Amino acid sequence: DGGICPRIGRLCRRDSDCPGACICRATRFCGSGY
Amino acid sequence: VVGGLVALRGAHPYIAALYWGHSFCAGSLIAPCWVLTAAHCLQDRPAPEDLTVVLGQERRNHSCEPCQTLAVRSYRLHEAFSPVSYQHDLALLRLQEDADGSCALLSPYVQPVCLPSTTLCQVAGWGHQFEGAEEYASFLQEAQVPFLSLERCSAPDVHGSSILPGMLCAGFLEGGTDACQGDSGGPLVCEDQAAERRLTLQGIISWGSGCGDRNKPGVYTDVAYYLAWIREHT
Structure with a gap:
């Protein structure tokens, strides 16, 4: 859905573990959303 | 990268x-x-x-x-x-x-890198080598990217109003070369191609929309813009 997704490397299990507009991807890392 | x-x-x-x-x-x-x-x-x-x-x-x-x-x-x-x-x-x-x-x-x-006082720039980092990659890079990666002007990065189908003072964009609008997750904080260093006399830190890897994708170049913190704050x- 676009937006600002910072490029920190971070393990995640929820979307809330990720900064800005990033989400928790299927790889269990934070990344850009839809 | x-x-x-x-x-x-x-x-x-x-x-x-x-x-x-x-x-x-x-x-x-x-x-x-x-x-x-x-x-x-x-x-x-x-x-x-x-x-x-x-x-x-x-x-x-x-x-x-x-x-x-x-x-x-x-x-x-x-x-x-x-x-x-x-x-x-x-x-x-x-x-x-x-x-x-x-x-x-x-x-x-x-060694420390020089700060800012026809220009080639390189970005480097250990982050994902593909958008949504499962794994960081083992070997440090380096890629050459060009500066992109403010009005081209502020275009609505690029980054629009999200580009603020103190930010900077580099890469190709057609895609293929960019920083990615796990590269944040890393350097964007530049050197003048007409003399090649000094490597200077011009950007800090910050954010993007995906990685290396079309019309979505990397956004960097503008080091020269914050020179006084760093000093x-x-």
Whole structure:
């Protein structure tokens, strides 16, 4: 859905573990959303 | 870094690696006791005792003989950094010193990078080599990217109104070459192609939309824009 997704490397299990507009991807890392 | 090559062993003596919790960032040694990174890497305010900085590395999280592992005694995020707009996305790490004020041992593998006072720029980092990749890069990656003007990066189908003063864009609008997750805090260094006399730190890897995708170039913190802030707090 676009937006600002910072490029920190971070393990995640929820979307809330990720900064800005990033989400928790299927790889269990934070990344850009839809 | 997407679309890069393996960095030469001696081509990146200023890059710092930051390990804590389950997160990873990079940084740039700008003085023996000071590293310049992105503020959003420390967005959750981790305790300085939890941070580990490593200098002189070619391979990610690798304990090499020229490698030097340092603790962080304190850090400072630029004031008014927003975890929403990501304006003012830069922070300073103060490394642990000894009795004689020495932090990093300068060496052929550990050197500070010059700050700003026909231009080629390179971005480097250990992050994903593809958008949504499952794994960080082991070998440090380097890729050449060009500056992109403000009005081309502020176009509505590029980054629009999200590009704020103190930010900077680099890469190709057609895609293929970019920083990515795990590269944050890392350097964007530039040198004048007409003389090639000095490597200077021009950007701090900050954010993007995907990695290496069309009409979505990487966004960087503009180091020359925050020159006075870096000088005052070091």
